[PDB]
Amino acid sequence: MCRDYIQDGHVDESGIFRPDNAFYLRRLTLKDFRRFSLLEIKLEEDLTVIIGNNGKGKAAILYAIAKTLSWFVANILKEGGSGQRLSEMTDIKNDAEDRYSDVSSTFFFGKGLKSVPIRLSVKPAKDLADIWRVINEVNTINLPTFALYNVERSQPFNTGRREERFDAYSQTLGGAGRFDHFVEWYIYLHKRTTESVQKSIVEKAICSVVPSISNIWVEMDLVKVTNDGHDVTIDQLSDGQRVFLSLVADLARRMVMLNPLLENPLEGRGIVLIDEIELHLHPKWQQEVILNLRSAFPNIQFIITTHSPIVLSTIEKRCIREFEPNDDGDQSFLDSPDMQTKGSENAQILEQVMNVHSTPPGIAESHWLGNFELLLLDNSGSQVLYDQIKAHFGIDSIELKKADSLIRINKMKNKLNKIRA
């Protein structure tokens, strides 16, 4: 029946379950939205990253998918439930003539449902969400997981809240995970301790994804963690540690509640948005965050946003959507950059993917290696140049190691010229 179209799948040789009718956002169009007159994005099935100078455009995007997914969420929850919508919250482009704004998005739900076009402010998303509701009522199915993690998840530390799978979707698109809800659910599972496998799966997710936390458990009621080899409390954790903990734990809780029938609930289909993946993260964790997420979140279409090149060093260039500088909202289509970023040098990423130098041009320290090179090649290899190399240099600093090599090459080229003559 229609249920088999949703429930069937196949496992990879890696052990990852793959839904054959994979659900992901395929194409997205914004008309007169925020700053875009008309803009088209094609999304990757696995992972997509938007980069750019100002946070406004990238947020906008993620805000648009969140509000679009809200209709799916509401119609999954309540019959004909009206989801979040624009309805004119000054989201109209500030000088648009149409005074109208459409978020045109085309979801793909496998071979059969090749196109599900939704636009906000026809809403046929109910036509699929009615299937997601009526099925999972007659017989349970692994519902699609949705989430948005905005800046608001850095918050300082009314429902049944528990044993109901629809405690998810409660405030998932609000921009901040319900970390308190996760703590409550954890406390109740620990009190009762299937609940055990849910708890163990969540704990494994925290331990694997988050570097610092090696173990987590509950004591008399209060939750303890083994952070940096020390047993401290949740509120004792740092802001960065707590933010990463809240994001991972909230997503894991929602997804284990939404996908009860999976052998591994961690790999259910869904769409997850992350506005600042590098929020309060040391570069050492930035080099590992996406690998850890993707290894723990296989099938999820991550549409994330970052300003950190260390993150981009771990992403193929096909997954970047790059807002070229000097990009007025009239740009029709975002596209990948030329340089392959995965595994490349950090300085090269700085120079060619974000168009800023490896050295800050704001300060010189009253000398500059480029000036020394220019003078040396002008003179072909000497008091002013030696004065330049005596500025702070004369030390092991790379600034001297390159200068001496260029002096050697200039003198050697002069000797070659002398012999040739």
Partner: protein, 205 residues
Amino acid sequence: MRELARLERPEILDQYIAGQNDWMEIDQSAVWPKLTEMQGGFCAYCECRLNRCHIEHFRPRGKFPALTFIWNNLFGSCGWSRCGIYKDNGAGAYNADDLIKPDEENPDDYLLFLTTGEVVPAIGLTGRALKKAQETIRVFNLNGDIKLFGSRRTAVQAIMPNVEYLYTLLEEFDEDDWNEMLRDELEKIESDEYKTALKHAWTFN
């Protein structure tokens, strides 16, 4: 490391004998100049410029008390997460025999330096030789340290245009003065940090 000639022992070591004398009973400033003449101011294990100077007992004092005052057991190490400090409190379960002692064994016979800043055992090593080079890499942390790798890599890449251009001029002259140029280039690296890596870059083999 480099190849070093074990210098004549300083006479200050003869007044101390193992057991009844602690190491701190020796004026460190009375033994440092001989190590400086030995090493030219660079670390014995990683060839970095010595600024955080530290007299190092190649065989540890705690496990080898009898060799605490033996002249052939003293090296001037830097430092800490590398070299001697990693040797006594970072690594473990090692045998000092497997470590390359750079005063009586040629380091180039075991350790090979790439252009990429990494150090791997030399080509053709088998059995005890490869084990020797591997433990020398590990215990001294010759490449696992980020600071050491980074500095050595940035030093090696700094001279690569020179290595490229030196050999390009092979057919430009008779080989005698080209050999003179190569010798001159091999002379300067002796006064620079990580000279073994630079030599591995410049040398024929």
